[model samples]
Target: MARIDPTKKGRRNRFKWGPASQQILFQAYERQKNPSKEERETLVEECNRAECIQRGVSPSQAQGLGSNLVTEVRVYNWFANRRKEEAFRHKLAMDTYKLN
Candidate 1:
């Protein structure tokens, strides 16, 4: 696939939205790049979510059961698992001896 010139349409889109490509443009909404104390706490929540799989971390552990954390972690887990799996496949391909 060819990349659209950033100087043309892409640049214009970036200016208009919080982030040009991604739906959630949190970065643009935030005044400074640095996470606030509240934001840090939020990131901690995200990290916890990243860690949990079975009995995944919840946004409100104290309040109740089940949270989006499990789903979130699964996404990252899926990627990690796929990456390792692909690496092993590539290794297998390399093992085939080839003559010039």
Candidate 2:
């Protein structure tokens, strides 16, 4: 099979939308921005749903549960970027206060 570029149209539907992808996207979504341990577990279950399996997953691996390090990096990057951005905004706010 030929490798398709995810950036392009028509071939975009073939993207791997597995547990890892769902976990990252869900974590990044505003509703689940900062999930707790129990929340993560719930997300785990939700991510392993039938539709998720249909997207790209084996029922066995899906039921295995818990997030993998490989995918966690994506989640980590999201939070890391957010934290840095938050710090930058805080600095700007502080500067504005000082200037006033």
Q: What overall lDDT, based on C-alpha atoms, would model 1 receive against the true structure?
A: 0.36
Output the TM-score of candidate 1: 0.24
41: Cα error in model 1, Å: 14
Model 2, global lDDT: 0.48
Where's the lowest-lDDT run of ten residues in candidate 1? 14-23
Best by TM-score: 2
Looking at candidate 2, the ten consecutive residues that score lowest on lDDT are 8-17
Give the lDDT of residue 94 in candidate 1.
62
Estimate, for each residue in 16-36, the C-alpha lDDT of model 2 and write its tens digit.
345555554556464656755
| Cα-based RMSD of candidate 1 | 17.2
lDDT of 1 by residue, 1-100 (tens): 7975544221222122112212222322243234345544443344444334224445456112233222233323333444555666676766433410
Tell me the lDDT of model 2 at 76: 46
Candidate 1, position 17, lDDT: 15
Candidate 1 regions off by >4 Å? 1-73, 94-100
